[PDB]
Amino acid sequence: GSSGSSGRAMKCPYCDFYFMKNGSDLQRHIWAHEGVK
C-alpha cells in the first residue's frame, strides 16, 4: 500500500460491490440480490 490511504467506501454484504458511504440508493442493490421487483 505505497499510495496514500483515501476514499473508504462501503462494501455490499451480498456481493463485493462498492457504493456511496451511506445512502438509500444502495439498499436498492441489496433487495435485488434477494428477488425484489
Site residues (vs Zn ion, CB under 5 A): 12, 14-15, 17
Quote the least distance from Cβ 23 to Zn ion, whole Å. Answer: 14
The answer on whether 20 is annotated among ligand-binding residues is no
2/15 with CB nearer Zn ion: 15
The answer on whether 29 is annotated among ligand-binding residues is yes
Which of 13-32 are b and which e, b meaning 16 or more Cβ less than 10 Å from the residue's Cβ? eeeeeebeeeeeebeeeeee
Binding-site annotation: residue ranges: 12, 15, 29, 33
Binding-site annotation: residue ranges for Zn(2+): 12, 15, 29, 33
